[PDB]
Amino acid sequence: VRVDQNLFNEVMYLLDELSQDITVPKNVRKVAQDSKAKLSQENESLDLRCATVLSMLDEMANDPNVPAHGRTDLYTIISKLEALS
């Protein structure tokens, strides 16, 4: 319980921060927006929500327009989702 909810809480906070971060590209903010909505789709299985979000964030982490600090922010979130999955 605790271990998964602390990871989930951190992922939501970090995605919210990323969505508001003017130092990463528009498309990264939008993916962060869509990710946090997907994780909030309380009618769908968590493992499933996480898989879709992991796919979305991985795509962004591989976009060469993303600045180094934004890539690390993406990897931090990915790393918590893979621990939660």
- Distance in Å from the first CA to the final CA of the chain: 13
Give the domain range for residue 9.
1-85
Q: Number of structural domains, the chain?
A: 1
Domain harbouring 64, CATH code: 1.20.1440.50
Other CB atoms within 10 A of residue 24 CB: 22
Pick from 68, 56, 60, 50: nearest CA to 26: 60
Separation between Cα atoms, residue 37 and residue 35, nearest integer Å:
5
Neighbouring residues of 17: CB distance < 8 A, sequence distance ≥ 6: 73
Residue type, 32: A
Q: Report how this structure was experimentally obtained.
A: X-ray
